[PDB]
Amino acid sequence: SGAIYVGNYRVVNRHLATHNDWANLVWEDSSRDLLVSSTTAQGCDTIARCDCQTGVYYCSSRRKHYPVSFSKPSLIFVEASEYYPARYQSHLMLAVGHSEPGDCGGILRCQHGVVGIVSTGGNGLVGFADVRDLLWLDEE
C-alpha cells in the first residue's frame, strides 16, 4: 500500500483505490495502473520533473529503502496478477529489486522529488508507474 500526496491530490495504484477515491475521482488510467483523487488537506510530496534513471524506493516487505538504477518509462508486457490479466502496461520503469504484491504504492524518488510508485515486480524485479509527465499535479 501507499500513496503520493501532492497539493490537493492523492495518487494511488488504480487496483488499490478505495470507494472514497472513486467517489472523489480526478483521473484514472488502467493501462498505467494509476488513479488520482481529490483531498481536503494539502500534501507534502513534491513531484520530480526530470529524466533521472537513479533513485531510491521503499520496499514494505523488507522495511527498507533501496538505491536503484531504473529504465525510462516504456510499454512493457506484464504477467497476470490478482489485479490485471497479463497485458501491456504503459509508462512503466523497471529496476532490479525485491517486490511482492503488497509493496505496491511504495515511492521511488530521485534528487528532484517523487518519480513514481511501485506497481509490478517479481523474480528480482520491481516495476514503477511513472508520474513525472503528469504536469497538472503541480497546479489547481
Ligand SMILES: Cc1ccc2c(C(=O)NCCc3cocn3)c[nH]c2c1
Ligand atoms: C512476485 C510478485 C507477484 C505480483 C506482484 C505485484 C502485483 O501483484 N501487482 C501488480 C499490479 C499489476 C500490474 O500489472 C499486473 N498487475 C507487485 N509485485 C509483485 C511480485
Ligand SMILES: [Zn+2]
Ligand atoms: Zn530526477
